[PDB]
Design an enzyme around this catalytic site. Sequence first.
Site, PDB file in Angstrom:
ATOM      1  N   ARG A   1      -6.750   3.785   6.968  1.00 43.23           N
ATOM      2  CA  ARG A   1      -5.824   3.775   6.141  1.00 43.23           C
ATOM      3  C   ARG A   1      -5.247   2.321   5.903  1.00 43.23           C
ATOM      4  NH1 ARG A   1      -8.151   7.833   3.734  1.00 43.23           N
ATOM      5  NH2 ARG A   1      -7.606  10.032   4.522  1.00 43.23           N
ATOM      6  N   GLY A   2      -4.595   2.174   4.847  1.00 46.94           N
ATOM      7  CA  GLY A   2      -4.032   0.774   4.466  1.00 46.94           C
ATOM      8  C   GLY A   2      -2.593   0.885   5.302  1.00 46.94           C
TER       9      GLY A   2
ATOM     10  N   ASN B   1       0.916  -1.177   0.006  1.00 43.26           N
ATOM     11  CA  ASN B   1       0.017  -0.061   0.096  1.00 43.26           C
ATOM     12  C   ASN B   1       0.820   1.319   0.066  1.00 43.26           C
ATOM     13  OD1 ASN B   1      -3.188   1.206   0.450  1.00 43.26           O
ATOM     14  ND2 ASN B   1      -1.549   2.191   1.594  1.00 43.26           N
TER      15      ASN B   1
ATOM     16  N   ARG C   1       1.180   9.845  11.176  1.00 39.29           N
ATOM     17  CA  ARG C   1      -0.095  10.232  11.315  1.00 39.29           C
ATOM     18  C   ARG C   1      -1.073   9.710  10.255  1.00 39.29           C
ATOM     19  NH1 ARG C   1      -4.351  13.940   9.613  1.00 39.29           N
ATOM     20  NH2 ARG C   1      -5.656  14.552  11.600  1.00 39.29           N
ATOM     21  N   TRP C   2      -1.347   8.345  10.347  1.00 39.01           N
ATOM     22  CA  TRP C   2      -2.301   7.579   9.570  1.00 39.01           C
ATOM     23  C   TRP C   2      -3.582   7.478  10.473  1.00 39.01           C
ATOM     24  CZ3 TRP C   2       1.780   3.423   8.725  1.00 39.01           C
ATOM     25  CH2 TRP C   2       2.219   2.724   9.885  1.00 39.01           C
ATOM     26  N   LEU C   3      -4.837   7.837   9.877  1.00 34.97           N
ATOM     27  CA  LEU C   3      -6.143   7.873  10.420  1.00 34.97           C
ATOM     28  C   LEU C   3      -6.410   6.066  10.445  1.00 34.97           C
ATOM     29  CD1 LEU C   3      -7.659  10.774   8.710  1.00 34.97           C
ATOM     30  CD2 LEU C   3      -6.807  10.679  11.172  1.00 34.97           C
TER      31      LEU C   3
ATOM     32  N   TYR D   1       0.525  10.270   4.296  1.00 38.05           N
ATOM     33  CA  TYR D   1       0.259  10.616   5.932  1.00 38.05           C
ATOM     34  C   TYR D   1       1.275  11.505   6.540  1.00 38.05           C
ATOM     35  CZ  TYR D   1      -1.250   5.757   4.754  1.00 38.05           C
ATOM     36  OH  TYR D   1      -1.783   4.658   4.080  1.00 38.05           O
TER      37      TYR D   1
ATOM     38  N   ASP E   1      -5.156  22.066   9.425  1.00 36.02           N
ATOM     39  CA  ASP E   1      -5.959  21.173   8.736  1.00 36.02           C
ATOM     40  C   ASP E   1      -6.668  21.779   7.183  1.00 36.02           C
ATOM     41  OD1 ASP E   1      -6.329  18.525   8.140  1.00 36.02           O
ATOM     42  OD2 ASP E   1      -7.973  18.376   9.535  1.00 36.02           O
TER      43      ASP E   1
HETATM   44  C1  LIG Z   1      -2.574  14.091  -0.962  1.00 35.34           C
HETATM   45  C2  LIG Z   1      -2.571  14.405   0.617  1.00 35.34           C
HETATM   46  C3  LIG Z   1      -3.404  13.112   1.060  1.00 35.34           C
HETATM   47  C4  LIG Z   1      -3.504  13.228   2.612  1.00 35.34           C
HETATM   48  C5  LIG Z   1      -2.738  14.194   3.276  1.00 35.34           C
HETATM   49  C6  LIG Z   1      -1.811  14.965   2.662  1.00 35.34           C
HETATM   50  C7  LIG Z   1      -1.864  15.089   1.456  1.00 35.34           C
HETATM   51  C8  LIG Z   1      -0.860  16.111   0.746  1.00 35.34           C
HETATM   52  C9  LIG Z   1      -1.064  15.858   3.627  1.00 35.34           C
HETATM   53  C10 LIG Z   1       0.162  15.416   4.248  1.00 35.34           C
HETATM   54  C11 LIG Z   1      -0.658  17.424   3.052  1.00 35.34           C
HETATM   55  C12 LIG Z   1      -2.112  16.381   4.886  1.00 35.34           C
HETATM   56  C13 LIG Z   1      -3.115  15.175   5.082  1.00 35.34           C
HETATM   57  N1  LIG Z   1      -2.526  13.919   4.653  1.00 35.34           N
HETATM   58  C14 LIG Z   1      -3.239  12.586   5.207  1.00 35.34           C
HETATM   59  C15 LIG Z   1      -4.006  11.905   4.532  1.00 35.34           C
HETATM   60  N2  LIG Z   1      -4.610  10.848   5.080  1.00 35.34           N
HETATM   61  C16 LIG Z   1      -4.300  10.569   6.352  1.00 35.34           C
HETATM   62  O1  LIG Z   1      -4.710   9.290   6.907  1.00 35.34           O
HETATM   63  N3  LIG Z   1      -3.413  11.259   7.131  1.00 35.34           N
HETATM   64  C17 LIG Z   1      -3.023  12.445   6.633  1.00 35.34           C
HETATM   65  O2  LIG Z   1      -2.190  13.084   7.290  1.00 35.34           O
HETATM   66  N4  LIG Z   1      -4.472  12.339   3.274  1.00 35.34           N
HETATM   67  C18 LIG Z   1      -5.083  11.351   2.510  1.00 35.34           C
HETATM   68  C19 LIG Z   1      -4.464   9.958   2.023  1.00 35.34           C
HETATM   69  O3  LIG Z   1      -3.243  10.260   1.489  1.00 35.34           O
HETATM   70  C20 LIG Z   1      -5.141   9.467   0.882  1.00 35.34           C
HETATM   71  O4  LIG Z   1      -6.601   9.321   1.412  1.00 35.34           O
HETATM   72  C21 LIG Z   1      -4.640   8.065   0.499  1.00 35.34           C
HETATM   73  O5  LIG Z   1      -5.442   7.849  -0.835  1.00 35.34           O
HETATM   74  C22 LIG Z   1      -4.858   6.949   1.404  1.00 35.34           C
HETATM   75  O6  LIG Z   1      -4.460   5.814   0.863  1.00 35.34           O
HETATM   76  P1  LIG Z   1      -4.898   4.419   1.543  1.00 35.34           P
HETATM   77  O7  LIG Z   1      -6.304   4.399   1.417  1.00 35.34           O
HETATM   78  O8  LIG Z   1      -4.110   3.451   0.816  1.00 35.34           O
HETATM   79  O9  LIG Z   1      -4.360   4.403   3.059  1.00 35.34           O
HETATM   80 MN   LIG Z   2      -4.258   1.638  -1.010  1.00 37.34          MN
HETATM   81 NA    NA Z   3      -3.459   5.012  -0.889  1.00 35.53          NA
END
Ligand SMILES: Cc1cc2c3c(c1C)C(C)(C)CC=[N+]3c1c([nH]c(=O)[nH]c1=O)N2C[C@H](O)[C@H](O)[C@H](O)COP(=O)(O)O
Ligand SMILES: [Mn+2]
Ligand code: NA
EC number: 4.1.1.98
Lengths: 465, 465
Positions: free
Chosen positions: A171-172, A149, A166-168, A153, A264
């Site tokens: 997330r994968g 994946n 910081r993954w929610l 994050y 945010d």
């Molecule tokens: C483009 C982008 C997407 C962020 C992101 C940022 C950017 C630039 C930041 C770094 C500027 C600030 C917020 N970020 C987070 C985020 N998701 C998350 O769980 N935590 C985050 O901190 N997201 C969303 C996350 O990366 C996307 O939803 C992916 O598609 C999740 O992939 P997954 O389902 O395979 O985990």
């Molecule tokens: Mn994925």
């Molecule tokens: Na992703």
Amino acid sequence: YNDLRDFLTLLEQQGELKRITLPVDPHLEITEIADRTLRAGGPALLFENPKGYSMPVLCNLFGTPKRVAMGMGQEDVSALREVGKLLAFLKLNMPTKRLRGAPCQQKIVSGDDVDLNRIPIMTCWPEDAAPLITWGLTVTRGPHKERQNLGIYRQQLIGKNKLIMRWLSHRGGALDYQEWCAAHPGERFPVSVALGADPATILGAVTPVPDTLSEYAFAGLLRGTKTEVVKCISNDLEVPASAEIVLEGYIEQGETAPEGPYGDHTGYYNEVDSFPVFTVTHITQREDAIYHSTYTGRPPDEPAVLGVALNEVFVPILQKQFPEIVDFYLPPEGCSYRLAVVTIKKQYAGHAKRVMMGVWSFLRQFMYTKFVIVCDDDVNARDWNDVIWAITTRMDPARDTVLVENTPIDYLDFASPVSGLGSKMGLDATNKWPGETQREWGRPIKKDPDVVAHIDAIWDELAIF
Amino acid sequence: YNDLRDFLTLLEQQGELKRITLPVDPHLEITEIADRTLRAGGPALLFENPKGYSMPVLCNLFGTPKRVAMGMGQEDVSALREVGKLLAFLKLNMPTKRLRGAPCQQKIVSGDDVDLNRIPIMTCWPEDAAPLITWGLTVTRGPHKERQNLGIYRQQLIGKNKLIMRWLSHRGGALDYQEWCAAHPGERFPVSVALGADPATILGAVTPVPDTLSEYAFAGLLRGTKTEVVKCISNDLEVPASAEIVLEGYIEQGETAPEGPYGDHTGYYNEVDSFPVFTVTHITQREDAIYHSTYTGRPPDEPAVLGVALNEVFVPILQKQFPEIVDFYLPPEGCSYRLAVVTIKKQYAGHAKRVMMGVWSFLRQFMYTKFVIVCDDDVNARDWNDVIWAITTRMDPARDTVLVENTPIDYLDFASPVSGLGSKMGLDATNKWPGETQREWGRPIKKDPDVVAHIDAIWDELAIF
Ligand SMILES: Cc1cc2c3c(c1C)C(C)(C)CC=[N+]3c1c([nH]c(=O)[nH]c1=O)N2C[C@H](O)[C@H](O)[C@H](O)COP(=O)(O)O
Ligand SMILES: [Mn+2]
Ligand code: NA
Ligand SMILES: Cc1cc2c3c(c1C)C(C)(C)CC=[N+]3c1c([nH]c(=O)[nH]c1=O)N2C[C@H](O)[C@H](O)[C@H](O)COP(=O)(O)O
Ligand SMILES: [Mn+2]
Ligand code: NA
């Protein structure tokens, strides 16, 4: 094979990249400049002279929708619907091509030599806790399948070799970690983060493909050729060969740190919260490495613009299920997911209500969408002049508003009565048919399509602007 | 190649077909006998001696779910989920094999010789307007594609050679006709009706495949071999070669007749309404022809039982979209579509509400479903003892009930305030999680699976019944 540098040259040739030679601080100043630039729809920015560092900072890469389309090899933003039909079908896909060597491992530093302070990590907003990495592709494997994946994050700087991850929880990466802990108690969780990969890989990371599938495989479809990768030095994870910088390490089970506050995408600060710590054992990079970064804040920001381009991808998927849908749009002003406007070819009394319930249930990206406005196909969903017109001429507020309580809501949405739980509102702004109203409904003004077409033809020659 | 006669022999060998030699009137009496039989879960019935006719009457063919499974070549009712996964994938399929001759054209009668009074058409309920054909596969083509739609539409006897064609407006037949009228003004609409085809063809007719696809192609997949057909005598439509009786003719544009009243699957009479007239120019049949018929009324009836078996087909399709769904059931008592019980593995506060909205929006078969009850996976959706238990121990009525107004409703549902428009109710009977309640929720009693398994093993030996 376009890496990121090829993409930057392409942009520069088209007046879509600007180099800044003035001294500019990664602390606060870059965000301010990028924010003005993006809000005026200007170019991507390469700060060649960041105050106190030698590595240039690239930001606002995807600050126009055009540049998102370009980064998928396409000319324009309408081509994104075709990648949407493709995405429908995955619901053989192509593996990665592993190189034996790669530019991203030209300069290597490890153990006690690792210093993340050498990188021009940005501080975005004045009350943010610390510098923050914002464009990292985090790569993980879970213990139960081979699939790699990729996610984005955000990562707070907390030491020479420590980031917060910081993954929610949906997330994968976070699921992979959680399963690793159960399946291999007490063992370090290997993780690697790639900064500045090719644009197909970056956009693939951010496109919500199934959890079953590697985001590397999708990027291959967008590109037309297999994603070229290289094995990490310290683990079995693969990172893009063209990456500018790569961080390798692990998460020590149990180790956590208070994260933030950080501004945010809603335009507010998230309050402090605990997340896993990512210990960095290696930093690999190119000669001449460029640090790719961004920021989130009050919309519109680069994430929001990414999100508008990716909504074009979902239209087809929705239309397959609901062919009555003509257009589906989530304005950036609504924090990118909180309000949707949908236009339909209405076919029976009550139709708008079925459509609302579809937005709220069909795809998970829209499960948390708290306002849905439904209109007819004579409304351009993307123009508040049309949408407000429809609302103010086709609704009786109490008859035509649907409220539903105790529905899932984003746990960071402070406006809901309880964390994770809140109401939703659907506005039925369609013309009311017999049964829905006993009045004589109004005949709307339609333009002559022959007059419109003629004016399109002579518009440039008219030269009004 | 199993035709219908092969199926009847199979049933008879298994004690699932009973022959009645006593005189029995197609007027009212057959319905009464079949109703008792079905309500006690008895066999299919072949009345060899219908008062006043020479052609035997077959009814209650699909009055058990077992016999529906058998008619798809499968052993038991659980195999229907596999045909559901198959149905998912169609969203090369096999054409028909056209024979040069067929048993269904052994005896032919046409023009002035056509007398539908020679057929033992049943009268079902005492205040029904007239005898009614109930198991006709109506075959049509539209003007815009080659696809042959098969549907079951009831047909009132109004003359020696006239039937009323009671298709509701969203059916394939009615759309085909409507388009024919626009595209070829004033021209007769060719139509043919097959009675007593093979069970794969009959069940294929009633399974909601896409309008894009011929129901003949699906039946081929259920069978494992192409559907064998024969060209009609008076038009280019193809009917099943094994049919017992075939009616050929046309609908004269503009010609309509008042239809009914007829007793309906809700257990009430539909009031009079106008529908197109089907003029019968030919009647073809086998030597020894058997007339296949049924009835609808207060549930449960054969349609309801068909509908419960076909709901098994939809479970997989729903589960693909909503993997949290463990079971999904539409009890016959609720007129087969008006109430659904859904069980889920709940994963977050508010989850039940997303599921309700999915039932109301994902598939069109459930767009008109006015009650939805959502429970956890410790409830057997098929047992009112569990469902009522869940409702009475896990709900606070006002907190946990969702009402939505001005939604699409079946135009024949007289209980709604306006034709075509009404409300829906969702009952969230899931255990309430923190956020949904501030109380300490109860720990439910779970059985020991080892005790259950042991009792399954010794159950027959215990011989309690
Ligand atoms: C483009 C982008 C997407 C962020 C992101 C940022 C950017 C630039 C930041 C770094 C500027 C600030 C917020 N970020 C987070 C985020 N998701 C998350 O769980 N935590 C985050 O901190 N997201 C969303 C996350 O990366 C996307 O939803 C992916 O598609 C999740 O992939 P997954 O389902 O395979 O985990
Ligand atoms: Mn994925
Ligand atoms: Na992703
Ligand atoms: C099994 C069955 C289905 C009947 C039916 C009956 C039976 C026995 C009768 C004859 C006993 C009484 C009610 N019938 C009607 C009917 N649909 C309809 O529009 N008008 C009807 O009169 N239905 C449903 C209809 O046949 C199915 O929905 C088809 O799948 C529709 O196919 P289509 O979507 O291709 O038109
Ligand atoms: Mn059909
Ligand atoms: Na049909």
